[PDB]
Antibody
Framework: EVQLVESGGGLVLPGGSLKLSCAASGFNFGSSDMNWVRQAAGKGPEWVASIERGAGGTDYADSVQGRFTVSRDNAKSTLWLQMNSLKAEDTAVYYC???????????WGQGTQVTVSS | DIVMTQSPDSLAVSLGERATINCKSSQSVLYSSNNRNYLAWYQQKLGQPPKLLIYWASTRESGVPDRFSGSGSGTDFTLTISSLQAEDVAVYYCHQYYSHPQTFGQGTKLELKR
């Protein structure tokens, strides 16, 4: 019954910005820790950002810190990822993920492709 | 950072065979406070997102058949499929969630062998 629907992927020039959304339903979003995890073609998943349940509190992979911002609105049951200063190496499918409070990833969305290219 | 290393990179298996795949973490993921390994396995079927199979190294997630099992502790982990079904052809990943950054292996491709 858990639904996680990402949107907003597209083409970005290097240096550009893009905002991803994740619409969540079928569970108590506000009491869930949420994450962005990306996966480049032929590679394993890479954790990008976390935001704690309730009122939030964030963490980032070192290589995105200062460029990317994760945010949430519990009433809207929506997670966002604002990506700035994008580079080619950020090209990937980006997934919205619900984590158990221990940290394992219980539910993943279908993903949205981000393409960063000149 | 904890680094996760999987082996083999690929394995070709025929229907009904036993298949074993391995994952090593560069540091132990056993938490002394609860005696749990912070180790998960995911299955990624073609064109789909990853799906949770196993957490705490050996606990099967709901909706996962008994032919899947996880074992190991500390740094050394295994995923076993006791009888490969066609639907089990997929890429399998291990994941440590002991400490940030959470990290993944590079996957093992389980391919169908005629």
């Amino acid at each position: 019954e858990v639904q996680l629907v990402e949107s907003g992927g597209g083409l970005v020039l290097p240096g550009g910005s893009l905002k991803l959304s994740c619409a969540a339903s079928g569970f108590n979003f506000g009491s869930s820790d949420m994450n962005w995890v990306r996966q480049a073609a032929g590679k394993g998943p890479e954790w990008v950002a976390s935001i704690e349940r309730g009122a939030g509190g964030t963490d980032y992979a070192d290589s995105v810190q200062g460029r990317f911002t994760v945010s949430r609105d519990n009433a809207k049951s929506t997670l966002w990822l604002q990506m700035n200063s994008l580079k080619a190496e950020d090209t990937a499918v980006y997934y919205c993920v619900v984590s158990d409070n221990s940290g394992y990833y219980k539910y993943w969305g279908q993903g949205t492709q981000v393409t960063v290219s000149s | 950072d904890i680094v996760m290393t999987q082996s083999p990179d690929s394995l070709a298996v025929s229907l009904g065979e036993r298949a074993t795949i391995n994952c090593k973490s560069s540091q132990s993921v056993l938490y002394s406070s609860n005696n749990r390994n912070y180790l998960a396995w995911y299955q990624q079927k073609l064109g789909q997102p990853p799906k949770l199979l196993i957490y705490w190294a050996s606990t099967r997630e709901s909706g996962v058949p008994d032919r899947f099992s996880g074992s190991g502790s500390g740094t050394d982990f295994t995923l076993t499929i006791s009888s490969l079904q066609a639907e089990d052809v997929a890429v399998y990943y291990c994941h440590q969630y002991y400490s940030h950054p959470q990290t993944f292996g590079q996957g093992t491709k389980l391919e169908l062998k005629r």
